[PDB]
C-alpha cells in the first residue's frame, strides 16, 4: 500500500516519512498513513519556516534579521513541537 508524492515523482509505504516542499520555499514533514486512499499527513512542527526570510530552518539553525527599528536580531530555531523560534537583540 503506497502513498505518492506526485511533485517529487516518488512513492512511500505506510509509516515512512519524508520531506516535501510547501508553497515554494517552506518545508513540511509528511508521513504515509495510506488508509486505502494514499493518505499522508504533513506538518512543519519540527521546522522553522520564517516568512520574513522565505527560508526553511532546522532545529538549532541560527539566522539574523532586522526588527522594525533597525536592530539586528539573532534567531534560533527551537521547534517546541510547534514550528517555534526565538530572536534576540
Amino acid at each position: 500500500e503506497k502513498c505518492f508524492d506526485h511533485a517529487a515523482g516518488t512513492s512511500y509505504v505506510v509509516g515512512e516519512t519524508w520531506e516535501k516542499p510547501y508553497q515554494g520555499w517552506m518545508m513540511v514533514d509528511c508521513t504515509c498513513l495510506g488508509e486505502g486512499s494514499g493518505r499522508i499527513t504533513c506538518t512543519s512542527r519540527n521546522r522553522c519556516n520564517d516568512q520574513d526570510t522565505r527560508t526553511s530552518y532546522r532545529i538549532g539553525d541560527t539566522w539574523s534579521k532586522k526588527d522594525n527599528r533597525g536592530n539586528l536580531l539573532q534567531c534560533i530555531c527551537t521547534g517546541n513541537g510547534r514550528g517555534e523560534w526565538k530572536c534576540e537583540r
Binding site: 513540511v28 486512499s37 494514499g38 493518505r39 523560534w85 526565538k86 534576540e88
Partner: peptide, 17 residues
C-alpha cells in the same frame, strides 16, 4: 538581549493515487 518568539505551523492531510 530582548527576546521575540514566533512560530509558524503548517498542518494538512491529503490523499494520493
Amino acid at each position: 538581549g530582548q527576546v521575540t518568539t514566533e512560530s509558524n505551523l503548517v498542518e494538512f492531510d491529503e490523499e494520493s493515487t
